[PDB]
Every structure is written in C-alpha cells, then in structure tokens.
Design a protein around this nucleic acid. Sequence first.
RNA 1: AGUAGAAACAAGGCC
RNA 2: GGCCUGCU
Lengths: 718, 52
Amino acid sequence: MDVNPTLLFLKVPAQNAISTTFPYTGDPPYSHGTGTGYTMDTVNRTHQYSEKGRWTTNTETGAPQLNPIDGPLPEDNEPSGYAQTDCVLEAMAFLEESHPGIFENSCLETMEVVQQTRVDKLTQGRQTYDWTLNRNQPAATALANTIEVFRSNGLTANESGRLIDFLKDVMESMDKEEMEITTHFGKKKQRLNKRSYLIRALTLNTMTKDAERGKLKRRAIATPGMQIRGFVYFVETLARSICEKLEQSGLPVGGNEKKAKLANVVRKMMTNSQDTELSFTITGDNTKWNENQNPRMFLAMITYITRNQPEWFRNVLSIAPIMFSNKMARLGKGYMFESKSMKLRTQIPAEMLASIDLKYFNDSTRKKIEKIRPLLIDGTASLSPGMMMGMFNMLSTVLGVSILNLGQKRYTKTTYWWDGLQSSDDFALIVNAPNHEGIQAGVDRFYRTCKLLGINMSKKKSYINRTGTFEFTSFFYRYGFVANFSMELPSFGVSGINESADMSIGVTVIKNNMINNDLGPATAQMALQLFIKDYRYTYRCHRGDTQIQTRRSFEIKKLWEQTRSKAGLLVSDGGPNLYNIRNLHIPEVCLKWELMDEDYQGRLCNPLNPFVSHKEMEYDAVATTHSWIPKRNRSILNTSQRGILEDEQMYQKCCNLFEKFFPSSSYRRPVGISSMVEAMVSRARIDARIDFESGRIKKEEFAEIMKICSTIEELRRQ
Amino acid sequence: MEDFVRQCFNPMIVELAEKAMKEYGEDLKIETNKFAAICTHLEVCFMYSDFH
RNA sequence: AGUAGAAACAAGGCC
RNA sequence: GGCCUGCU
C-alpha cells in the first residue's frame, strides 16, 4: 500500500479536513538579498497597466508622471488601471444615498479627531524612512530627527504639540528656500536645495517582504517617509470611521466579527430567496490590487466625502492623495556582482543604475533597467500611477463596498441582484436570479462595473458555485464556518519576550484557540505539555529533580533543594507544572500563591529587585523578577552613528528626572508647551510653598530650595 | 502693528504672551489684536500681583 | 564543493 | 596579531 493522505478527501469533505493542506509547519520563504529586482518590476508593471494613459512632466519634482484616469476604456480582460472618474463618483453618490448621512457623521468624528490629536501619535508606528539620514529608523527616532531639523531651520509651529501644527510646519518647509541638516560622518552641514528636499520628502523606501506564506515569488513592500505619515493617518481615520458604519465592510473589525457579518449576509441572501430563485456565491479575488488604485481616485473620493465641510478640514484631508500622486519609489539596496575568474565580489548602490553600463546584468535585469531608466531621477523612480503597498486599505475597501452596494436591485433595474462582503483585496459576492442566464448576466455586470471603477477580478483564482460552500480570506464556510487550526499553529511556540510573559502568552493562546478555533480538550492538554517542554528547553528551567546539565542547572537544583514546598516553585525556577484545561485563564504566579514558601514568595515578587522593567496580544501578566528584558544587538558601535547612544543616555537621564518630578508622566503622556526646566522649577517652587504653608518644610529648607531654584533659573537664562 | 506690542511692553511679558499664543495655536501675524490683548491682560495681572 | 533560488551566504568594518 | 558586531 502506498499511503496517500490526499485520498482522505474522498470521505472527509474538503472544508472539514482543510487544515491538512496548510504547510504552516516549515520555515516560510525568506528574501535572500536585495529588493531592487522586485521594485523595478513593480514600477514597470504599474506603468504597463496604464501605458495608454496621458503622460506629463511634474513641474516641481521635475520627473515624468502618468495620468491614466479617464483613459480609454479597456478592450481586453487584461488588468487595466483606467479608472473612470464619473463612475467612481456615481458609486460614491449611490453609496451615500443608500446610507444617508454616513459622510457627514464620518466628517464630524474625523474633525474632532484631527483637532484633538497630538504629535506623539506618529511615534506609534513601524519602521519609517527618515529623510535626514536616507536610512530606515524607528518611528520615534525619525520624528525626533525631523522635529530637530525643523526647529533648526526656522520651522517652530509644531511646538504647540498638536499634530496639525506639525503638518503646517511640514507644508511650510517645502516652500523654504534651502533646508540644511547636520548629519554626522565632528559633523558636517549638508544643504539641500528646494527640489532636492522636495524629492526627498516625497520619496518612498522599498524593502523586500519577508516571511510570506502562500506565494512562490517574493514581493516588495514600501514604507513612507515622515512628512506623509500624518496626512495618511488622518485619511485612514476618516476611512475607518466610514467603514465602521458599513454593514458590508469587513476590514475595520476582527476575525469573529467578520464571521458574524459573513454569516448574516449569507443567511439574508440564500434564505430570503424563494424556491424558484437560484443563488451563487463567488469566492473571487482581485488581481494586482495595489497596481491599479490610482491616488487621483482617492482624491476624488476624499473630495466627494468632504462636501459641505470647513475648507481647512477638506485641505488637510486632501493633502495625502496629492502627495501620494507624486511619490518617488526609492529603488533599494542595489544589485551585487561577482567575478568567478578573479574570485571577488562587489556591491553597487542602486543609485548608479541610471549611469552604469548594461554589460554586467542578465538578459532580464538588463531589460528591466532599460525600461525603468527613463523614470529615474536622482536615484529614485517616479511611481505616480499606482500604490506600492496598502497604506489606504480602508479607503480601497470603501470603494469595494460601494461597488458591492451598486447592485441592490434598486440600481440593477433587473431581476438579478447581488451583494456580499468586501475586505481589501478579497470579496465574496452572492448572486441571485430566476434562471442561470440571469446569474451569467449578473456576473458580467459586476465584472464590467468593477473594471470601470479600476479594480480587476482575478479570473484564475475565482470560481462560482451554488450558495453554501464558499471561502473568504481563509475562513472556509460549509453550511456554517469550519475552524481551520493550521493558521494559528505558528503562535504556539514560546513567543520570546521573557519568562513570565512567555508563560502567560502561551497559556492564553491555548485558551483562545480552545474558544475560537475549536481545539479539543485532549489536543489542548497535549499542546500544553508540548509548550511546557519547549519552554523548559528554551529557558533552561528544567524541573530540578532531573540531572540535566546546563549553564543554569546548578542553582536551579540548589534552589529546589533549599525550598520546603517544592510544589510551589514557578515553572521558570524548576517547579512542577500545575496547569490543566481548567486553569488556563489564571496567571501562573497567582495560581501557586497558596503553595509558595514565605521566603521564596518574598524574594520572588520584590519591587526592590533590579530586573523588573516597570512594564512595557493581551497577555495577562503579573510583575515578578522573571519580567526582565533582553539585551540589544549593539551592532551600531562599529558604524559612524556611535554618537546616537550618548543621545539616548542623556535623553533617558532627563526623562527619568522628569518622571521623578511629575509622578503622572509615566502613566499619562505629559502635555504642555513649557520647556522642561521651567516646568521642573515651577513644580519645585509650588511644592516647597505648599509644604511650608502646611507640612514638613521649614524656613531654612524653603530658603535653600528657593535660592537653588533661583540659581537654576539664572543658569537657564544664560 | 507688531512694533507697538513689541515696544510698549516689557520683553518678558511679550515673550510669555508669545508662548501662550503658540500654545493656543494662533499666529500673531494675523491676529495681532489678540496678541496685544493677551499682553495687556498679562501686564495687568502682573502689576496686580507684584509689590505684595 | 555545499545551502539556495530570480539573489544571496560560503564572514564583515576599522587601525 | 589586538579591538569591536551576530537583525543596523
């Protein structure tokens, strides 16, 4: 017998045993080098789905740009980026008519948000490209550098603390005659003329995407600069506000709410239909979603949403698509060469691709360079006619929801009609009709309308079958959603934060999978045992009874011997495991409280210990000595950016002192626009005053503190 | 009219009034009268406080 | 040689 | 040979 797992589907319906076909147990494919081979391909393809568009030449950045909007209607099924503005506005207007007052309320909420938001919100972000070093720096570091340069160069309106003030600074910067920065290499002053700074503000940094499941070919993902971050934030806020009010938009909610919405839609469509009507669920998928959402359509949507709103709000919302329409996509790391005969290798920056000869490359990269060269300007390529990756998923989902709404049988004016649920890049459409040709006509109408709006259905990944069985972004549905457990498999291992955090996170993951993904009792117990085994093997915290020999075993054994109630030690200190199917919701240290020795209990959770980091998926945690934090890579030391570490040290010292002065700074972010020294001195003076008025402080101490504050103020004023 | 507000008042009063205006978000270039009013109120309160 | 797959590793920077 | 790095 030749065992054949796939033959199991002759009996088990595919949906039920669908977890078998998810190879999520092996290392995901990882990009092994430079993302400059995929970025050029993305640029070329984006310019190839819109070549019939209207070329032009931007008069500020001085780079060619493509304008496909209102282009010739597509004549073949191939992807087309020729969105029609009239059709987009019709979709939006019908969406507003079907949902009266959606845009007005969304604009009100966003006006409140934009008037209220602070500059600190830009720190809560992932890697961003900071335009002052031409590298990728964390969000906070990039924001700090940008604010430093703005203050140095005369822009200071962001000191008010509101985000919109920083945006005003950003806009006023682009008009500055010549910016200058003081980057190190002892430091030099590099001056950027108007055009250079403008091109650097609009530039996008592109890096290859890593750890992608379900694709054979690597993609490219881009991260926006720091000037475009705030406008994108406001636009995303508006789009989320709009989507939260749409029953057919699944993007702004979690998995379970997606399940609820999709089940509701299926029940509404299939059940309400009479016996004679047919039904058909299209589990489709859009192809080249990003390479066709032209930002000018986003500007049209933003202008139609913000009708009858204050001009300032309209402008601050519209600035984002205006900046994205002129974006330049920084190529990337640049290719690398080798010499088999001479036995050496060289690295060429991506900047010199415009000037380097084509005698080095392959037969494909040579064509890619030959085709991308016209668009290059100062080491970056114009990428006007498309997006790079998301950054507007909410608004794109709004567009998808509008096109889904456009077939409510009030706009179809025909027997057939459709609806469904839209999540950016993924849709499920449910057609109805009185005969099969009706379904055919409905599908054709939907496809053509989507093509007009500039979004293409993928015909090689979509099938239409009688309602019931269907799929949606990996939530398979067979007369009721079936839980596939292979998607959440990667979460079971030790997360890797620290000991207590790892224990809490693992037990919480097991509990959640028992709740949602229908993990059985016995399987939950085996997952618990395997997690404990992995956790012990990773943290060297074996049970103590064992004769394991490791770098940490000696004093784990010593502590085990010392203790009296050995059944109370934390699993991190070699204690027994006491979890089961009924204790998964109780944090470990709270679980063994009754069984703990007084001495060990006191030593364990001692605030004086130097390991707790004063805190930092929602995993229920308890402060304990096992909450230490891991080190950092320390790889900067070799580079020329050694001085940044001194900046970090000084900033931490100052912020710790401020924390000392203002107790609430740690809990709630400190607001205000008074310099730090002035705030500290004022607080000290008022504290001394109130203490002397009624308290411990006496006249001598009051005089000493007041004179110290006076000399501090004198030192400040110098 | 910035000369009037910059001259007729003390430097510290105008400085802290500038800080207040920046806090509230206004621009002194446009709402000069508000700047003068803020400076005048601050001077009034300071003269009220001092010498006691 | 080997891993690996549309580009890389098979050590790198400085004195 | 010595120093420094193992996501910069």
